[PDB]
Write a protein that holds these residues in place. Structure first.
Motif, PDB file in Angstrom:
ATOM      1  N   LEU A   1       0.864  -1.060  -0.001  1.00 28.10           N
ATOM      2  CA  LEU A   1       0.001   0.063   0.116  1.00 28.10           C
ATOM      3  C   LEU A   1       0.857   1.176   0.097  1.00 28.10           C
ATOM      4  CD1 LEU A   1      -2.609  -1.048   2.677  1.00 28.10           C
ATOM      5  CD2 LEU A   1      -2.886  -1.154   0.065  1.00 28.10           C
ATOM      6  N   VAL A   2       0.547   2.104  -0.897  1.00 31.33           N
ATOM      7  CA  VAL A   2       1.208   3.246  -0.904  1.00 31.33           C
ATOM      8  C   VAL A   2       0.993   4.180   0.577  1.00 31.33           C
ATOM      9  CG1 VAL A   2      -0.576   4.891  -1.719  1.00 31.33           C
ATOM     10  CG2 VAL A   2       1.922   5.401  -2.623  1.00 31.33           C
ATOM     11  N   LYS A   3       2.266   4.807   0.838  1.00 35.98           N
ATOM     12  CA  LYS A   3       2.226   5.597   2.060  1.00 35.98           C
ATOM     13  C   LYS A   3       1.875   7.093   1.810  1.00 35.98           C
ATOM     14  N   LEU A   4       1.057   7.317   2.541  1.00 37.45           N
ATOM     15  CA  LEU A   4       0.392   8.833   2.834  1.00 37.45           C
ATOM     16  C   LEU A   4       1.370   9.417   3.766  1.00 37.45           C
ATOM     17  CD1 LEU A   4      -1.676  11.014   2.158  1.00 37.45           C
ATOM     18  CD2 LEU A   4      -2.657  10.329   4.303  1.00 37.45           C
ATOM     19  N   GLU A   5       2.142  10.501   3.178  1.00 39.70           N
ATOM     20  CA  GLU A   5       2.920  11.339   4.126  1.00 39.70           C
ATOM     21  C   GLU A   5       2.558  12.566   4.392  1.00 39.70           C
ATOM     22  OE1 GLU A   5       5.979   9.799   4.514  1.00 39.70           O
ATOM     23  OE2 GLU A   5       6.622   8.547   2.869  1.00 39.70           O
TER      24      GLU A   5
ATOM     25  N   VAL B   1      -0.348  13.866   0.140  1.00 38.94           N
ATOM     26  CA  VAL B   1       0.794  13.790  -0.436  1.00 38.94           C
ATOM     27  C   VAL B   1       1.332  12.416  -0.033  1.00 38.94           C
ATOM     28  CG1 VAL B   1       3.016  14.961  -0.341  1.00 38.94           C
ATOM     29  CG2 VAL B   1       1.100  16.293  -0.116  1.00 38.94           C
ATOM     30  N   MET B   2       1.443  11.707  -1.154  1.00 34.38           N
ATOM     31  CA  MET B   2       2.023  10.315  -0.954  1.00 34.38           C
ATOM     32  C   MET B   2       3.393  10.115  -1.491  1.00 34.38           C
ATOM     33  SD  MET B   2      -1.427   8.728  -2.697  1.00 34.38           S
ATOM     34  CE  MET B   2      -1.640  10.182  -3.508  1.00 34.38           C
ATOM     35  N   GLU B   3       3.986   8.885  -1.298  1.00 34.14           N
ATOM     36  CA  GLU B   3       5.330   8.606  -2.000  1.00 34.14           C
ATOM     37  C   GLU B   3       5.052   8.522  -3.252  1.00 34.14           C
ATOM     38  OE1 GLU B   3       8.438   4.966  -1.688  1.00 34.14           O
ATOM     39  OE2 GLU B   3       7.162   5.058  -0.003  1.00 34.14           O
ATOM     40  N   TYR B   4       5.936   9.081  -4.070  1.00 33.02           N
ATOM     41  CA  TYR B   4       6.152   8.945  -5.471  1.00 33.02           C
ATOM     42  C   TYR B   4       6.840   7.769  -5.855  1.00 33.02           C
ATOM     43  CZ  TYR B   4       7.375  10.028 -10.424  1.00 33.02           C
ATOM     44  OH  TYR B   4       7.357  10.100 -11.656  1.00 33.02           O
TER      45      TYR B   4
ATOM     46  N   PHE C   1       3.030 -13.359  -9.564  1.00 33.91           N
ATOM     47  CA  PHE C   1       3.877 -12.546  -8.566  1.00 33.91           C
ATOM     48  C   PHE C   1       2.949 -11.328  -8.123  1.00 33.91           C
ATOM     49  CE2 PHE C   1       6.756  -9.039  -8.320  1.00 33.91           C
ATOM     50  CZ  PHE C   1       7.469  -9.242  -7.130  1.00 33.91           C
ATOM     51  N   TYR C   2       2.499 -10.672  -9.088  1.00 35.18           N
ATOM     52  CA  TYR C   2       1.497  -9.513  -8.709  1.00 35.18           C
ATOM     53  C   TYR C   2       0.261  -9.938  -7.929  1.00 35.18           C
ATOM     54  CZ  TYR C   2       4.343  -6.922 -12.063  1.00 35.18           C
ATOM     55  OH  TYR C   2       5.304  -6.302 -12.778  1.00 35.18           O
ATOM     56  N   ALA C   3      -0.471 -11.157  -8.519  1.00 32.92           N
ATOM     57  CA  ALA C   3      -1.423 -11.588  -7.819  1.00 32.92           C
ATOM     58  C   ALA C   3      -1.295 -11.955  -6.335  1.00 32.92           C
ATOM     59  CB  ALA C   3      -1.940 -12.743  -8.611  1.00 32.92           C
ATOM     60  N   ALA C   4      -0.293 -12.797  -5.923  1.00 33.67           N
ATOM     61  CA  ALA C   4       0.109 -13.010  -4.868  1.00 33.67           C
ATOM     62  C   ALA C   4      -0.024 -11.762  -3.872  1.00 33.67           C
ATOM     63  CB  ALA C   4       1.386 -13.658  -4.639  1.00 33.67           C
ATOM     64  N   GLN C   5       0.687 -10.572  -4.234  1.00 27.95           N
ATOM     65  CA  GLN C   5       0.677  -9.485  -3.505  1.00 27.95           C
ATOM     66  C   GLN C   5      -0.552  -8.736  -3.167  1.00 27.95           C
ATOM     67  OE1 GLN C   5       3.869  -6.655  -5.005  1.00 27.95           O
ATOM     68  NE2 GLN C   5       4.215  -8.506  -6.050  1.00 27.95           N
ATOM     69  N   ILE C   6      -1.441  -8.788  -4.236  1.00 33.05           N
ATOM     70  CA  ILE C   6      -3.182  -8.602  -4.302  1.00 33.05           C
ATOM     71  C   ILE C   6      -3.667  -9.574  -3.166  1.00 33.05           C
ATOM     72  CG2 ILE C   6      -5.287  -7.921  -5.311  1.00 33.05           C
ATOM     73  CD1 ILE C   6      -2.853  -5.903  -5.950  1.00 33.05           C
ATOM     74  N   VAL C   7      -3.415 -10.776  -3.160  1.00 36.41           N
ATOM     75  CA  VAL C   7      -4.269 -11.568  -2.178  1.00 36.41           C
ATOM     76  C   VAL C   7      -3.847 -11.180  -0.950  1.00 36.41           C
ATOM     77  CG1 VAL C   7      -4.097 -13.990  -1.468  1.00 36.41           C
ATOM     78  CG2 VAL C   7      -4.321 -13.450  -3.771  1.00 36.41           C
ATOM     79  N   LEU C   8      -2.551 -11.098  -0.466  1.00 37.66           N
ATOM     80  CA  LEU C   8      -2.136 -10.635   0.757  1.00 37.66           C
ATOM     81  C   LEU C   8      -2.577  -9.264   1.385  1.00 37.66           C
ATOM     82  CD1 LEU C   8       1.536 -11.773   0.768  1.00 37.66           C
ATOM     83  CD2 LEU C   8      -0.149 -12.670   2.079  1.00 37.66           C
ATOM     84  N   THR C   9      -2.723  -8.506   0.179  1.00 38.92           N
ATOM     85  CA  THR C   9      -3.098  -6.953   0.401  1.00 38.92           C
ATOM     86  C   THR C   9      -4.678  -6.947   0.867  1.00 38.92           C
ATOM     87  OG1 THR C   9      -1.475  -5.707  -0.981  1.00 38.92           O
ATOM     88  CG2 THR C   9      -3.531  -4.550  -0.458  1.00 38.92           C
TER      89      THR C   9
ATOM     90  N   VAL D   1      -0.380  -0.312  -4.204  1.00 39.13           N
ATOM     91  CA  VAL D   1      -1.616   0.160  -4.484  1.00 39.13           C
ATOM     92  C   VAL D   1      -1.824   1.592  -4.135  1.00 39.13           C
ATOM     93  CG1 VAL D   1      -4.389  -0.381  -4.007  1.00 39.13           C
ATOM     94  CG2 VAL D   1      -2.575  -2.301  -3.878  1.00 39.13           C
ATOM     95  N   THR D   2      -2.403   2.203  -4.972  1.00 42.57           N
ATOM     96  CA  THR D   2      -2.731   3.657  -5.098  1.00 42.57           C
ATOM     97  C   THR D   2      -4.167   3.789  -5.274  1.00 42.57           C
ATOM     98  OG1 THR D   2      -1.888   5.818  -5.569  1.00 42.57           O
ATOM     99  CG2 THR D   2      -2.108   4.411  -7.260  1.00 42.57           C
ATOM    100  N   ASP D   3      -4.682   5.075  -5.202  1.00 40.02           N
ATOM    101  CA  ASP D   3      -6.225   5.381  -5.350  1.00 40.02           C
ATOM    102  C   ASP D   3      -7.120   4.669  -4.303  1.00 40.02           C
ATOM    103  OD1 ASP D   3      -7.975   6.527  -8.132  1.00 40.02           O
ATOM    104  OD2 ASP D   3      -8.225   6.415  -6.094  1.00 40.02           O
TER     105      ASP D   3
END
Length: 340
Positions: free
Chosen positions: A93-97, A109-112, A135-143, A172-174
């Motif tokens: 998950l993208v970090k909100l700074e 304002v998030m990490e770029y 590889f991508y799908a595994a990250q979504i499953v965990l997320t 993941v953004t948005d």
């Protein structure tokens, strides 16, 4: 589930709830940043590359016009987005700074992430091999395991919302449609190609819509096009609700089987929404090669690293007309956005 997973999620929820109940507010201001380039634009906001004038760090700043948010009936969604983003913490998950507001706009304002969107890379390459899609799908499953355990539904999974970072992993953004929901929710939102049947049919729906969307994403990654498409939304929706999908002959049998269980029109039979929850997905033969812990720890070598020259490179984003960030002399919509 192993007690190690149960304890991980219990701590994740504790930490989320503390931030959820006491959200951060007003942690920077606009004139702390230089504007570099518009990275994307929509009906009520934009995303801009900015540079912090004191530290020199680059960030992606999402700017929402309060008056357009009101007009387009997105108030609750915008409040959801910021309250969720400031409370979550997960590797994908993208970090909100920072966040703040002024007379005219809301700012997150998030990490770029200079690597850009998965959608651009997918369209450039054509399709991803099954190992690459996996590889991508595994990250979504965990997320989703993380988000759903916090009672969060994401509701906008699609390759455009998945940034590829400097290690080749997803951010993941948005979170514009993300929502904290115990039980069911009713809002019509998402992207047509990714909508579950129960959204199209105007039902009270739950986190099973995210697992449906994962099926769409895996199909699109592995085929190069989504499973349900057509010139007009109504024609897409007819296909979605029909219970029919056709698979390319190059798909493996295991991939087809997983997809039939994610793209299951009956939500009470859909993988991710059964008694065994996410484990029906994690234990499926299509994921037999996946080392779930190593993915979480970012120890797996990624399929590819986006090409970029440094933290300020915008080559993986496209070009938009540069418009003013105007701030009115008078406060707009103060009451509606008090909590932001």
């Amino acid at each position: 589930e192993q007690e190690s997973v149960k304890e991980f999620l219990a701590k994740a929820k504790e930490e989320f709830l503390k931030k959820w109940e006491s959200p951060s507010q007003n942690t920077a201001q606009l004139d702390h940043f230089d504007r570099i380039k518009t990275l994307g634009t929509g009906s009520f906001g934009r995303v801009m590359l900015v540079k912090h004038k004191e530290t020199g760090n680059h960030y992606a700043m999402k700017i929402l016009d309060k008056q357009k948010v009101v007009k387009l009936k997105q108030i609750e969604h915008t409040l959801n987005e910021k309250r969720i983003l400031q409370a979550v913490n997960f590797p994908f998950l993208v970090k909100l700074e920072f966040s703040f507001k002024d007379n005219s706009n809301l700012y997150m304002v998030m990490e770029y992430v200079p690597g850009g969107e998965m959608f651009s890379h997918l369209r450039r390459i054509g399709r991803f091999s099954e190992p690459h899609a996996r590889f991508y799908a595994a990250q979504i499953v965990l997320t989703f395991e993380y988000l759903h355990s916090l009672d969060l539904i994401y509701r906008d999974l699609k390759p455009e919302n998945l940034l590829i970072d400097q290690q080749g992993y997803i951010q993941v953004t948005d979170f514009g449609f993300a929502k904290r929901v115990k039980g069911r929710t009713w809002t019509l939102c998402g992207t047509p190609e990714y909508l579950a049947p129960e959204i199209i049919l105007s039902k009270g729906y739950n986190k099973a819509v995210d697992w449906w969307a994962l099926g769409v994403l895996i199909y699109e990654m592995a085929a190069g096009y989504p499973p349900f498409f057509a010139d007009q939304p109504i024609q897409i929706y007819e296909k979605i609700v029909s219970g029919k999908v056709r698979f390319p002959s190059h798909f493996s049998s295991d991939l087809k089987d997983l997809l039939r269980n994610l793209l299951q029109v009956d939500l009470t039979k859909r993988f991710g929404n059964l008694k065994n929850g996410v484990n029906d997905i994690k234990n499926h033969k299509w994921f037999a090669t996946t080392d779930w812990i190593a993915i979480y720890q970012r120890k797996v070598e990624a399929p590819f690293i986006p090409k970029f020259k440094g933290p300020g490179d915008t080559s993986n984003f496209d070009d938009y007309e540069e418009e003013e960030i105007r701030v009115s002399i008078n406060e707009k919509c103060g009451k509606e956005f008090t909590e932001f």
